[PDB]
Ligand binder design. Structure first.
Ligand SMILES: [Cl-]
Ligand SMILES: [Cl-]
Ligand SMILES: [Cl-]
Ligand SMILES: [Cl-]
Ligand SMILES: [Mn+2]
Ligand SMILES: [Mn+2]
Ligand SMILES: [Mn+2]
Ligand SMILES: [Mn+2]
Ligand SMILES: [Mn+2]
Ligand SMILES: [Mn+2]
Lengths: 99, 103, 97, 78, 98, 83, 105, 94
DNA sequence: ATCTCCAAATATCCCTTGCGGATCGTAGAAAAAGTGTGTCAAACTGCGCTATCAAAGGGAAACTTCAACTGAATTCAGTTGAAGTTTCCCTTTGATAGCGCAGTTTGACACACTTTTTCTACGATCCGCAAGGGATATTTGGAGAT
DNA sequence: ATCTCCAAATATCCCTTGCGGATCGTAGAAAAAGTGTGTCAAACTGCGCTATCAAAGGGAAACTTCAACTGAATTCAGTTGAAGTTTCCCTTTGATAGCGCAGTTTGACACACTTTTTCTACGATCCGCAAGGGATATTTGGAGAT
């Protein structure tokens, strides 16, 4: 103890879960996981950067699910966007229900 | 956890922490990290779904970089989204221009 | 027995378009990087993965460039890539003026 | 060192690119083009290294430089 | 009656247009095309006049630069006549798609 | 009234002038339709983003800034109309 | 000297730049010298373009600078052209340039 | 409402450089775009640099290496020296 | 060579517009002044991991031999795009009447955030074991010669 | 077309190691709480965007003529690819030497926030006046023709 070797932090586990939900009998190498972690960080940054600009453009001090949504429409191509807006909208609907 | 309340595998709390530390805006609404976490999840679900089949077609139970590269490049939209990205150890889609082939 | 010119080359294309192995010998590539780095800052070390990052990026770049260069060659009724082809690819890419 | 990137090495690269026939002057062009590429990336990478008051060029330093040149790389810390 | 050889007027046309900066596409037609395309994305949209101006400035600069590259592709093929395949080669290398 | 076929308003002589400024001396008759197609894809991508900024601002009037912000997004920054 | 620009020996508004950096969410805190340096750099770049566009205007026997002048200035300069390699100047037109093979023979 | 712009400063730097030369409305709009653009590009990179090095503040240092990363060689040497010179003088006051 | 002659350039009168220099009342922001408050430079410190040393082989790089066939050059003609003319379509210009709607304004308050205690998901670390590596064999898909 | 030879794909089986499921401690997400301001709605509005037109005429469309560009066809010097000999150095294995990256702790002070005072800079309205772009006639550079 005392001097703890820092502490990284990735999406590796949430990734692995998703891999199970779609490919129960499929595994993943350490290198491919690194690629998946980059992808997630990359997408996150791209989406928030837009929402941030949307917020600024419209002189608003807050990033809501509305800026996340149209940021998604600007960043993602056709079909991927339509679906993504489906999952996001659904998550928000469900999440608010849960009390 | 907010994820459960939202039916997501992806960390809604973490995403919320990251949205506040990245200096994107003075404030972050409550639904923003949920919506973003869902999208992130969908997209990684979408990739793994296709990379998995590439692993299958190549007869391997383990997804490797090369499989993620095939899934991405054989998919019009993912190829567009990652048009400026290079997947290390991904190689390229086998492709020889017709006129180069022997009759 | 002799394979006709192009036949082995075509074979090589199939082989490499099926693997993901780096194609430039490692040690040589590492020296080049240090020599270049050295021209901008003396006394510099490199994480082993840093050099490898540069190689992954360097090769993905050359490979894609050859794809462009090859199309230009073919655009000119040729099957042999030439400097003019690499030059035209970079000019249109915006890599060059 | 520029010669370390050998002719056969440049051939394999062009093969992955799908090239079937290679003029003899391509090898020198490629070396010149690779040098400019590395110079640009390494230049930016070393700028990050110095700004962090470090003497060791990190993978992240390279990845940030590759992101600045519009060549985002996945696999080393993105 | 007098007759310049084919290509002589072409050249002075290049010099005339390379000296100036005014939009080369008729204004109302461009505006209609813009409104038709927007309308397929959303209905009941209105445009500021400058919003259309901006679109036309961007479109013409885009096309003018595409033609320059297209010409380089034609010349690369030992021609002097731009052709559909020259534009296609240009957009393919530029990474432009669709 | 319904809007149709306006890509035709982009006439042959107008495309010709554009090719001149771009230094082209000889044009194939097949170029005009190739250009209309290309221009169409171009306006579609930019306008699609211009309209997304409009809808987000809860507006009905596409502004010069939505266009400017859209062009910037596509890696084609425009000087002269704001921002 | 009252204004911070005055203190820095600058024409550009140090005060406005400091505020713009703060209202742009680039970081939670902005140092005292950040807007002086940034205002000095922005002042320098516009001096460089006004200078070159200014010369272009005199070459065209002009007293006033218009977009075309800024365009000729930017594209005839290797550094500015690269800095604005992905920018389009409205009403700038292009540089006079005709490929050789097209010239009469 | 009010409408900010770099116009007055741009006129100023113009007179120091070409005392008998004017600028048209559109050309000024372009200049204003240029300034807002370069600012964006610089502040943006400085922002990343600070984040990369876990810093909470953007200093003249992050602005400096952002200037070296963004400007083509030469335009950067001069900007860097006008920048360093301005901060040096400024700190010399109060 | 030497002349005819088409379109860009040059030159004169007219006038309206956008620009540099003013002069003015002022909303709103920069500066000056007080003081909380946490970010960060220093400073000694531990150990991860980058650089480096030394000997050997094996396979990759380099050099050599030979000629297959590809790139460049020459000749030629149906094709097709440029130049010029004629007609008249519908863009451009200019004033307009009407309202859709962008944008300022003002009080209610839902909602994000700060501070703190508690509960817990996820990171650092482990090791068996099976997917993948890797070596030798049998099969399968094709190229090249008869 | 069909037949002999090469190399890739495929089957087989034993070794290597990184996947992936466990364990344990904890940094961080969550919960209940007390606080205020950015956001949303409702009411007011005039810039300006849409629809429209009326006369002018600039520019698009369509057709005839034919100059000359594209590109099919043929040719052959030689640059390249394939395969074999020769020369070289990258890759791999067992670790010390110690550089310098990163963890810890900390308090001066640089920067945030607030309130009052000073003043810059923008919107509205006037001016000397050269810059300037159009209506209209003449000179000029040189492409094309006698
Ligand atoms: Cl929200
Ligand atoms: Cl060449
Ligand atoms: Cl074609
Ligand atoms: Cl500072
Ligand atoms: Mn429609
Ligand atoms: Mn058998
Ligand atoms: Mn693991
Ligand atoms: Mn006419
Ligand atoms: Mn030390
Ligand atoms: Mn004469």
């Amino acid at each position: 103890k005392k001097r703890r070797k820092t502490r990284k932090e990735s999406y590796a586990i949430y990734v692995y879960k998703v891999l199970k939900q779609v490919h129960p009998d499929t595994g993943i190498s350490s290198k491919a996981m690194s690629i998946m972690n980059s992808f997630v960080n990359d997408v996150f940054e791209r989406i928030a950067g837009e929402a941030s600009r949307l917020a600024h453009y419209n002189k608003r001090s807050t990033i809501t699910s509305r800026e996340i949504q149209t940021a998604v429409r600007l960043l993602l191509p056709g079909e991927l966007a339509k679906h993504a807006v489906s999952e996001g909208t659904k998550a928000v609907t469900k999440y608010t229900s849960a009390k | 956890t907010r994820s459960s309340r939202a039916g997501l595998q992806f960390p809604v709390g973490r995403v919320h922490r990251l949205l506040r530390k990245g200096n994107y805006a003075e404030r972050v609404g409550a639904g923003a990290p949920v919506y973003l976490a869902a999208v992130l999840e969908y997209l990684t679900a979408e990739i793994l779904e296709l990379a998995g089949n590439a692993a299958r077609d190549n007869k391997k139970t383990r997804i490797i970089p090369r499989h993620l590269q095939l899934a991405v490049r054989n998919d019009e939209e993912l190829n567009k989204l990652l048009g400026r990205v290079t997947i290390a150890q991904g190689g390229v889609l086998p492709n020889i221009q017709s006129v180069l082939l022997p009759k | 027995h002799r394979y006709r010119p192009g036949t082995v080359a075509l074979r090589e294309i199939r082989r490499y378009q099926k693997s993901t192995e780096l194609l430039i010998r490692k040690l040589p590539f590492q020296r080049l990087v240090r020599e270049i780095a050295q021209d901008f800052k003396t006394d510099l070390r490199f994480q082993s993965s840093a050099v490898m990052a540069l190689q992954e990026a360097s090769e993905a770049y050359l490979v894609a460039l050859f794809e462009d260069t090859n199309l230009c060659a073919i655009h000119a009724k040729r099957v042999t890539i030439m400097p003019k082809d690499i030059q035209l690819a970079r000019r249109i890419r915006g890599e060059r003026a | 060192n520029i010669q370390g990137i050998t002719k056969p090495a440049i051939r394999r690269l062009a093969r992955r690119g799908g090239v079937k026939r290679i003029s003899g002057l391509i090898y020198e062009e490629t070396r010149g083009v690779l040098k400019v590429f590395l110079e640009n990336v390494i230049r930016d990478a070393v700028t990050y290294t110095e700004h962090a008051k470090r003497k060791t060029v990190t993978a992240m330093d390279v990845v940030y430089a590759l992101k600045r040149q519009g060549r985002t790389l996945y696999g080393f810390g993105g």
